[PDB]
Design a protein around this ligand. Structure first.
Ligand SMILES: [Cl-]
Ligand SMILES: [Cl-]
Length: 129
């Protein structure tokens, strides 16, 4: 599913991401936009053979099992395919573990490079939340 901006904001809000670990909703919308263009089915392969999955491009090296990232972990305890669902619950629950691990949203490269220090509230402007 390709989410609309406001639709996704509202889904993330319902799933407890607004202000989660001090990150306002705009940060999460901004990250999703630049990681996946709001497409739950996005995949991208990394140089080391790991793959990033879903709306927030969660990486099989640490977070999910895809059966082809030898020596990787599965810290969210999920198959990576669950991260591609039109229901973002699994992505959101896994993202909460990532953002809690000490590095905050810096785990998401596109967030660090395209959202951090910008006016992220613009991403939820106009939305009925
Ligand atoms: Cl694996
Ligand atoms: Cl933080």
């Amino acid at each position: 599913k390709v989410f609309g901006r406001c639709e996704l904001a509202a889904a993330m809000k319902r799933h407890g991401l607004d202000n989660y670990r001090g990150y306002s909703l705009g940060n999460w919308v901004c990250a999703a936009k630049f990681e996946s263009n709001f497409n739950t089915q996005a995949t991208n392969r990394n140089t080391d053979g790991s793959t990033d999955y879903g709306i927030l491009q969660i990486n099989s090296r640490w977070w999910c099992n895809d059966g082809r990232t030898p020596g990787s972990r599965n810290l969210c305890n999920i198959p990576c395919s669950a991260l591609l669902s039109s229901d973002i619950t699994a992505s959101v629950n896994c993202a909460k573990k990532i953002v809690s691990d000490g590095n905050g949203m810096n785990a998401w490269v596109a967030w660090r490079n395209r959202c951090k220090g910008t006016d992220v509230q613009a991403w939820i402007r106009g939305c009925r939340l």
